[PDB]
Design an enzyme around this catalytic site. Structure first.
Site, mmCIF file in Angstrom:
data_model
loop_
_atom_site.group_PDB
_atom_site.id
_atom_site.type_symbol
_atom_site.label_atom_id
_atom_site.label_comp_id
_atom_site.label_asym_id
_atom_site.label_seq_id
_atom_site.Cartn_x
_atom_site.Cartn_y
_atom_site.Cartn_z
ATOM 1 N N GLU B 127 0.706 -1.072 -0.028
ATOM 2 C CA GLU B 127 -0.004 -0.010 -0.217
ATOM 3 C C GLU B 127 0.859 1.155 -0.046
ATOM 4 O O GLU B 127 0.506 2.369 0.626
ATOM 5 C CB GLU B 127 -1.016 -0.089 1.162
ATOM 6 C CG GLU B 127 -2.098 -1.206 0.951
ATOM 7 C CD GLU B 127 -3.072 -1.470 2.156
ATOM 8 O OE1 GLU B 127 -2.972 -0.602 2.971
ATOM 9 O OE2 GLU B 127 -3.494 -2.501 2.345
ATOM 10 N N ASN B 179 2.663 -5.119 -3.121
ATOM 11 C CA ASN B 179 0.976 -5.489 -2.909
ATOM 12 C C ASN B 179 0.301 -4.438 -2.877
ATOM 13 O O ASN B 179 0.497 -3.146 -1.927
ATOM 14 C CB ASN B 179 0.915 -6.381 -1.767
ATOM 15 C CG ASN B 179 -0.385 -6.990 -1.685
ATOM 16 O OD1 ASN B 179 -1.160 -7.550 -2.660
ATOM 17 N ND2 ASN B 179 -0.888 -6.873 -0.269
ATOM 18 N N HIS B 215 -9.998 -6.473 -3.259
ATOM 19 C CA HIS B 215 -11.194 -6.401 -2.256
ATOM 20 C C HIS B 215 -12.330 -5.904 -3.272
ATOM 21 O O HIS B 215 -12.426 -4.717 -3.305
ATOM 22 C CB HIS B 215 -10.775 -5.659 -1.193
ATOM 23 C CG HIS B 215 -9.753 -6.288 -0.291
ATOM 24 N ND1 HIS B 215 -10.261 -7.486 0.478
ATOM 25 C CD2 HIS B 215 -8.493 -5.978 0.111
ATOM 26 C CE1 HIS B 215 -8.932 -7.822 1.112
ATOM 27 N NE2 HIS B 215 -8.048 -6.983 0.971
ATOM 28 N N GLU B 246 -5.676 -11.032 -1.463
ATOM 29 C CA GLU B 246 -6.637 -10.680 -0.366
ATOM 30 C C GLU B 246 -8.020 -10.777 -0.926
ATOM 31 O O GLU B 246 -9.035 -10.071 -0.580
ATOM 32 C CB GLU B 246 -6.596 -9.312 0.003
ATOM 33 C CG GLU B 246 -4.739 -9.201 0.553
ATOM 34 C CD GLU B 246 -4.553 -7.986 1.491
ATOM 35 O OE1 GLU B 246 -5.582 -7.484 2.167
ATOM 36 O OE2 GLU B 246 -3.369 -7.855 1.691
ATOM 37 N N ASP B 248 -11.685 -11.291 -1.753
ATOM 38 C CA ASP B 248 -13.103 -11.336 -1.315
ATOM 39 C C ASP B 248 -14.060 -10.551 -1.791
ATOM 40 O O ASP B 248 -13.474 -9.614 -2.688
ATOM 41 C CB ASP B 248 -12.967 -11.052 0.415
ATOM 42 C CG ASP B 248 -12.205 -9.617 0.824
ATOM 43 O OD1 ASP B 248 -12.416 -8.833 0.102
ATOM 44 O OD2 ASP B 248 -11.760 -9.639 1.871
#
Ligand SMILES: [Ca+2]
Ligand SMILES: [Ca+2]
Lengths: 345, 345
Positions: B127, B179, B215, B246, B248
């Site tokens: 990030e 990432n 996400h 990650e 979802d």
């Protein structure tokens, strides 16, 4: 319980959207509310979009909760007529809607009139103040104000005056609150609150009281700051009421530059830890500052933001467990509950 | 299970901080991991401050997890050497620390060397790109970068270069990833990711791969944009790996300007609802895009961000229930799980 210790409302936020915290379904939660509290705030289901089924008003689910309160010895604090977060915006509340001010008036008129003498008090406008840490709209500070769709569509803060006036006409018996968070820090947002409030009083706007959310941590802000913040508001008027609307107390502080004092495991404070003992003192000292700084006849209530820790919005926050409320994962009183009894007593 | 259908890592985030999702404590979760997955990421316990007890290194709890994995058939993706959020910053990672650059070096060198043959891959920097949604530093954008403590202390983005060089020297076998989230939207952040990666490639920095957190929600962003975003990065280099880190999938979109299509009740999608069916298709289309866009040989893995819906960070979000993962509240496989098997098959 708690309610019997005070002559002003002692309230709790209740859930009504299924799962374990659902007030209709959790008869253990019901028995805590009946035993301890005498006012309820809807945690979610009286937020703006919940008043609608698409474009028609729909009060079935909220009328359910208000009728429950009535039969279970609770008054109700209505949360909230006007508030910005997109997830709860009615579909009319868009930059694109050229009939915005009309739909904005029909909302206030219809909802306040509907609940006319079944709700004791409203958050008429919630969170109108710019907060550096919470600006989803992106637009930055407009003289202290959040530039939410309401601000944008009205061109300024006059949507606030208009929400008060309209609610007061629709229900002349309701206690009308301005409510916000981080105004207890006694910083820049507290100063914007005082100017916000002075302006409404200068304009003749019917505001009855100011709501302090009080989403605090065990050790921040200091109580001298919380005390002063409340003092400054009480000074603005001889009559203006002070309500603590959303009280919860985080053991963990992830903003203090110190990861070594953090509780990172769920087991840490499930039964006994230093933070639960400081939490007893922190709840105690806030309720004491309230009683000391807010004269009798101007105490609008203290409300805690949920029944049991696992119900809390903050039972996780910043990827850290927490234990923010008066009752523990087993619905048992925490040392926090005692602090409130000692303060009220 | 899933891992047997692919020739790249098929991974899951695991919790280890007590309560229900704790992998050391839930034999039912352990059995799912053993059955379905061949890689773990620690959800929390490998974050920066978890590497310390005060000022000393402490590897005890993270060594237990890595030991766990090796024993139960799992490789380990390390999450993360460098990351900004304050809750997880070691005490050294301060503007007030004159030794910052030294402490920064010693962190990378020590943690990387400590896990050296034990962890397959690292989020080296996580990030680093500015996000309009997510700027707790308050500083805004510096040429597409987040002005985190690391960026401030270095006067620029060269802390990224250094973190990759030091990891590579300390563990020459680990696959080294950058990432980030929202880089699959194909918007302004995709463009900054492009600049970031071009620069590192230009400087001769040892980056192995790019991670897409992914996400996402059921209907945003479009897979055409998700496809092009990944293509843009695969285009940069004939060898750079792509990893889904990650993943979802939210049923609820509280950003689409429609509060009439939200599931507001925990019971809505507990057994069946339309969102669960779209979710099958959504998982399926994202894994298909991945397989289509990223050459075999350059496939770093697909990781899902938790085991069962109640374990998820998004089990609640924006005050709305959600059902984001492949296993339900009863640890039963959801349609989501079939969408994966279909795409992998
Ligand atoms: Ca701390
Ligand atoms: Ca929606």
């Amino acid at each position: 319980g708690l309610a019997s210790l005070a002559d002003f409302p002692i309230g709790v936020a209740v859930a009504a959207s299924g799962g374990n915290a659902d007030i209709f379904t959790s008869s253990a939660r019901q028995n805590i509310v009946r035993a301890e509290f005498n006012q309820i705030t809807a945690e979610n289901i009286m937020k703006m979009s919940y008043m609608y089924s698409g474009s028609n008003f729909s009060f079935t689910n909220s009328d359910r909760l208000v009728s429950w309160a009535a039969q279970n010895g609770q008054t109700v604090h209505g949360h909230a007529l006007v508030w910005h977060p997109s997830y709860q915006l009615p579909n009319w509340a868009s930059d694109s809607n050229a009939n915005f001010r009309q739909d904005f008036a029909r909302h206030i008129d219809t909802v306040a009139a509907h609940f006319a003498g079944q709700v004791k008090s409203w958050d008429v406008v919630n969170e109108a103040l710019f907060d550096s840490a919470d600006d989803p709209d992106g637009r930055g500070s407009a003289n202290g104000y959040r530039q939410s769709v309401f601000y944008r569509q009205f061109g300024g803060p006059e949507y606030i005056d208009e929400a008060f006036r309209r609610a007061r006409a629709a229900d002349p018996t309701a206690e009308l609150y301005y409510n916000d968070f981080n105004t207890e820090e006694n910083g820049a947002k507290t100063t914007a609150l005082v100017n916000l409030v002075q302006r409404l009083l200068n304009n003749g706007v019917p505001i009855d009281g100011v709501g302090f959310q009080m989403h605090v941590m065990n050790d921040y802000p200091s109580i001298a700051n919380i005390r002063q913040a409340m003092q400054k508001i009480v000074a603005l008027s001889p009559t203006l009421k002070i309500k603590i609307t959303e009280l919860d107390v985080r053991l963990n502080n992830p903003y203090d530059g110190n990861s070594s004092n953090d509780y990172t495991n769920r087991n840490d404070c499930a039964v006994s830890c230093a933070g639960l003992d400081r939490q007893k003192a922190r709840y105690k000292e806030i309720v004491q500052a309230y009683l000391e700084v807010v004269p009798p006849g101007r105490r609008g209530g203290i409300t805690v933001w949920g029944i049991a820790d696992p119900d809390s919005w903050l039972y996780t926050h910043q990827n850290l467990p927490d234990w923010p409320l008066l009752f523990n994962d087993n619905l048992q009183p925490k040392p926090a509950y005692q602090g409130v009894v000692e303060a009220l007593s």
